[PDB]
Amino acid sequence: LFNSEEDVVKMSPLPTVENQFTPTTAWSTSVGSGIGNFYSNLHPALADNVVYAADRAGLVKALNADDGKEIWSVSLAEKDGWFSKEPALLSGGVTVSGGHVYIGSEKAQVYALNTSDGTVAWQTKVAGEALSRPVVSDGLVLIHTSNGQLQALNEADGAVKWTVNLDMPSLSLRGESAPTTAFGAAVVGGDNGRVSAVLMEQGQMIWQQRISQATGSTEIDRLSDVDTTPVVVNGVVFALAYNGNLTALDLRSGQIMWKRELGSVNDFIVDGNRIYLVDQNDRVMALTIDGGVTLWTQSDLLHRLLTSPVLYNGNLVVGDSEGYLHWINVEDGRFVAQQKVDSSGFQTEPVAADGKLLIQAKDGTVYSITR
Amino acid sequence: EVPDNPPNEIYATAQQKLQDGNWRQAITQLEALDNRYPFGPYSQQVQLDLIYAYYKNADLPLAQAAIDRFIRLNPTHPNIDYVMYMRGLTNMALDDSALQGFFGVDRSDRDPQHARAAFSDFSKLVRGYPNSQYTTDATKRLVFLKDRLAKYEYSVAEYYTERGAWVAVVNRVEGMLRDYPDTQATRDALPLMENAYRQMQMNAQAEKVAKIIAANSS
Amino acid sequence: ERVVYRPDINQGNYLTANDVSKIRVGMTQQQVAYALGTPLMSDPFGTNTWFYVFRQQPGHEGVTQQTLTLTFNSSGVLTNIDNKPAL
């Protein structure tokens, strides 16, 4: 009653919970510390029976992907600077490649924890922390900074290859434009509502396409966590603009194949021809790869902050940042299992790796899920 | 005020409250007449009633705006002889209005700020309408305001004697010189500058004042 | 009368010793007006005399004054450098 008189606007819950399948967990091994209330694009990785889970608060875990048993644990809570034991404060998600675990920090100081023990098999202070996960690929650590600096490193020491300012809006227009490699070309979206292609070998712009409006004189959405990480099918960039406006366009020239340049889309998979997506309508849709034609759709999850679309246990699986997990029809949009396993909700996305389904919640963090 | 009513009936209700002297209630009609019909035919006459009715209701910030409205409404108009006179009169009421005159206390020592502004409008009347029904009326204010400015200017010239700032004595009376060629307070300010010269040991320059004092003893 | 704390009266519109040596008779008003500017009093009906006169009162300690008037001709060219101390 002592908070019963104030007033804010409202966003709709999740209707039609259906559980024709039984959903379970694979195990629980929650770090607990993790995202929490503090939003970040950090997300775990899962490889080699190791659930690579952690926090930006400092602790690094190696959970055994049978039970989530702690294999090793180190901590990147920083022992020095202006104070001992200051939290890790990580920008990007967990990249695990080779004998290295890479996470970009918000200190712009990046590491390579040797995956077998978590010992920093090399570190590197970099120039500007990332709006993306550190894209460690092809000898290089591809970085889209907070400043939008295309920085490539060497993934054995962090030997910085270049630093190139990208498509840059006014403020930190918060979107993971991860610099992807498509056929030796650095391919990235853009938080300025536009898209670009760059030579991955030296940092040389293949093309840059102005695509969609961003905030400033045409104000667009700040609830859609747009995947400005491009998912290019070999010659056609399939990616989101910073407003979520969709276009299909050539990899090699940027020439528009088709568009749904109307979007508020958050997360997407280009699944074959049937493009599964997350709106900020929070309505699921299967779009087509040749014209974004709705093959099927589902608005059963309106005003839910959902996670990424994944296919697991033969069903389209999606969780939310509320703790609800949903086994969508792979076809038209029916919950075949629905799982409320968390109250903290899942900010990271489902990693359908090691035969499992890894999601890290905000504070009920690591819930490995099966059915 | 008034609902969306017949405008002449609103105007006649206003016209009765003109004859009522119900300036609190006439403007209640006169606004809602022009709140719905400012393009109406007597709505410009409503403003010419309103400048009268504001001043009758002592509504000077409204009498401010309505004149400046009629500046923008009718920059040419025959009734600007009414307007430019009342613009000084609005300033005349705006400058000095206290109840200390009922106690028999002067207000010419108070600021002639709008009295300066009225001194414009009254002179802007008799330049703009030198043949008006208000021309000698404003000129009688222009007679009256000028010495009221001078009695103000004499009062501020007094203190510099009492301060002893004889430099500030001279230039204030020099302002009283260039403004007023006839005011008696300037003739009362006349020997004090001669004192100020003799208090600045400029007695020879003060002797020039004495000959004008000789030329203006009576 | 027996008051001693008398808050001090001061006044400018005057010149210092360099300013007296900075000018000379035959200078124009403008020649003064470049180096010394205007006085804060001139001659309003007689021939132009440029009044740079110091005034000051020390509290129950007398009076302080440096009087300096500068008559030009009708061409505004210097004819007089009057220097005068206090009373």
Partner: protein
Amino acid sequence: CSSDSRYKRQVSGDEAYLEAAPLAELHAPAGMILPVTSGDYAIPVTNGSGAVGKALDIR
């Protein structure tokens, strides 16, 4: 609730603008005439009267 006579409201007003008079023009001898005019303080005197002061009241 109704009150009545003996001074419900205050009264004020004056013809003070009429009560002034144009004052004594200052003569100065030769060599001592200085200017005495500045803008509207040299008033533009024009005639054509109308009723003066509150003797004239219009709409």
